[PDB]
Write a protein that binds this ligand. Structure first.
Ligand SMILES: CCOC(=O)c1cc2c(=O)c3cc(C(C)C)ccc3oc2nc1N
Length: 610
């Protein structure tokens, strides 16, 4: 069967949504064949017309309105979103523990712009949720998010207000729940098992929320509630974004609506975050990657303060390396004039004073046990959770490999940087002995024409200078490829891209995703055949074997060699800082000596009787 209008037609199997006042399917155009969303509604045209006049990038554009053939049902033709809704995107195991940062900033940008455009024209939306946010591919390949379903008539639950759960600011609540869900991959207020079951406990978590906290989870049967005003360790965003995002959520999820943040200050603080640029920085001594969110007009002084807040490194000790060479940021240089940085090519921050080692902080997760009981909904949910765990193992393994590669590149540049400091001091020593060993014979040039006070002390300069000479060659001996500061252990420890460990985990991940997606098809068709049933259980045992092999290769290879590379890197960090301290001493001694040679080059020239 298929219904139609004057210009469109649509089957019934291609159904996307159904209500009591309208029914939404996908359909074509009789004259063009393009795909459109069709809301067959099953006076009121007043608000339909003013909604038809809208035109914004982040709004599902309501095209036209027509009449159906059989019944004169007033239908609405809308824009079709093949990629689905944000709720659909948050169910792919790649986003099980949070969206990527670039996609998260896209969501925050399009949602805020769409809501501002609705308040600007005076349209209210009660339940803003990931289901009401659609995804459409833009002309530049990047996702574009559009709003829909704002205006209906009736007769979710986890996104309601404490005033409303007993059955704008009230809508800003569902925004904070949506943004926490998109950033963490999970709901902020989770009772034990489904919130639909412990609906009475949900009211306890919402109204009894302490100020400043954003999360509350009950991890046991009738147990307690773990509160936190901080993002979980499994969050996909960087700490530079979490520090700017957390106060927004904490002050828009405020219980008493008298102290909600308000949309005006909300739109201002969000636009402040979106107008910022990102600068990738990598702490070589701490082995940590960072993303500094700074405005295009701030100075390098504020940049050093943000690096301090992420690393506890005093701005007076921050020394920067970029593309092999030094990087001196003037205290007034604007941020938009810095060198452009990526995750693969960041700015390296190092301090002359010793720093502790951290590495990568991730939450150790195990595999959940698979239930041999045949259950379409149970195995579909189990497959989703276990595939998201392997996705998390893929992301951590790729991050560990990037850390090791950035350590290898940063260490190489640091050694070639110390080499330049060495060749600078030798150039200065050779610049001052050219007058020391010269003026000492200028003295004896006058002797053959008391004075021993100069000689018996000037010889104490070359005495204290040859000690620097043998101390410089000892420093150079460590910079030799066989010295104590070798560069080969980085090529011997840890994992390399030629190992292709990330590709092996992604291959097992694609097999698990194929099985999970087939389980997603099985859950819909609530009954399977005998042969399809055996295939379902065969692939479930294959899910266990796939994830077991993935976790085994991850811990017994990716993690183990990473810990060995990091542990061997800490002793090289200590020895490197020891060499920089000695070289700085041998450097300043040449300066304190060159002022004495300049002091005695003129004392030997007395006044003459002329
Ligand atoms: C009332 C507003 O609803 C839309 O406007 C709209 C919605 C959707 C979808 O939820 C959708 C879902 C899927 C999967 C569940 C299979 C696939 C394609 C979809 O495409 C959509 N297009 C729309 N225009």
């Amino acid at each position: 069967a298929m219904q139609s209008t004057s210009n469109h037609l649509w089957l019934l199997s291609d159904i996307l949504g159904q209500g009591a006042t309208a029914n939404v399917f996908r359909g074509r155009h009789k004259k063009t064949g393009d795909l459109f969303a069709i809301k067959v509604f099953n006076v009121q045209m007043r608000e339909f017309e003013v909604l038809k006049k809208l035109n914004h990038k982040n709004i599902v554009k309501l095209f036209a309105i027509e009449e159906e053939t059989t019944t004169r049902h007033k239908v609405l033709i809308m824009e079709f979103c093949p990629c689905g809704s944000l709720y659909t995107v948050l169910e792919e195991p790649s986003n099980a523990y949070g969206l990527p940062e670039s996609e998260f900033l896209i969501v925050l940008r399009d949602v805020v712009g769409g809501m501002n455009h609705l308040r600007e024209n005076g349209i209210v939306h009660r339940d803003i949720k990931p289901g009401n946010i659609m995804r459409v591919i833009g002309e530049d390949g990047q996702s574009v998010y559009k709003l829909t379903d704002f205006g209906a008539a009736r007769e979710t639950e986890e996104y309601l207000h404490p005033d409303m759960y007993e059955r704008a600011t009230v809508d800003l609540w569902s925004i904070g729940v949506t943004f926490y869900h998109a950033a963490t991959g999970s709901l902020p207020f989770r009772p034990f098992e489904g919130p639909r079951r412990n609906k009475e406990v949900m009211y306890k978590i919402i109204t009894g929320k302490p100020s400043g906290a954003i999360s509350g989870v009950q991890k046991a049967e009738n147990g307690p509630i773990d509160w936190s005003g901080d993002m979980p360790v499994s969050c996909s965003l960087s700490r530079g974004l979490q520090v700017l995002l957390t106060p927004v959520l904490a002050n828009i999820l405020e219980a008493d609506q008298e102290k909600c943040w308000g949309f005006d200050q909300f739109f201002a603080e969000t636009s402040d975050i979106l107008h910022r640029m990102v600068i990738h920085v990598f702490s070589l001594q701490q082995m940590t990657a960072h993303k500094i969110y700074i405005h295009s007009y701030n100075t390098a002084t504020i940049f050093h303060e943000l690096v301090y807040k992420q690393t506890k490194i005093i701005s007076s000790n921050q020394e920067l390396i970029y593309e092999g060479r030094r990087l001196v940021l003037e205290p007034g240089r604007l941020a938009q004039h810095f060198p452009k940085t990526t995750e693969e090519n960041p700015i390296f921050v190092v301090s002359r004073e010793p720093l502790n080692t951290i590495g990568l902080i991730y939450e150790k997760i195990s595999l959940p046990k698979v239930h041999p009981r045949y259950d379409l909904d149970g195995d579909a949910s189990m497959a989703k959770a276990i595939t998201g765990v392997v996705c998390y193992a893929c992301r951590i393994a790729s991050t560990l490999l990037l850390y090791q590669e950035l350590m290898r590149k940063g260490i190489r540049w640091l050694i070639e940087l110390i080499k330049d400091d060495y060749n600078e001091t030798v150039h200065k020593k050779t610049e001052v002995v050219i007058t020391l060993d010269f003026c000492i014979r200028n003295i004896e040039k006058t002797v053959k024409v008391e004075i021993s006070d100069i000689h018996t002390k000037l010889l104490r300069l070359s005495s204290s200078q040859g000690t620097i000479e043998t101390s410089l060659q000892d420093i150079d001996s460590r910079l030799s490829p066989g010295g104590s500061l070798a560069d080969a252990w980085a090529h011997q420890e840890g994992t390399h891209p030629k190992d292709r460990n990330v590709e092996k985990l992604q291959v097992l991940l694609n097999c698990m995703t194929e099985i999970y997606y087939q389980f997603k098809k099985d859950k819909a068709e609530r009954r399977l055949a005998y042969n399809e049933e055996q295939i379902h259980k065969f692939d479930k045992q294959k899910l266990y074997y796939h994830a077991t092999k993935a976790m085994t290769h991850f811990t017994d290879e990716c993690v183990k060699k990473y810990e060995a590379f990091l542990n061997k890197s800490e002793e090289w960090i200590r020895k490197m800082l020891h060499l920089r301290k000695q070289l700085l001493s041998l450097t300043n001694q040449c300066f304190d000596i060159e002022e004495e040679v300049s002091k005695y080059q003129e004392y030997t020239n007395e006044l003459q009787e002329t």
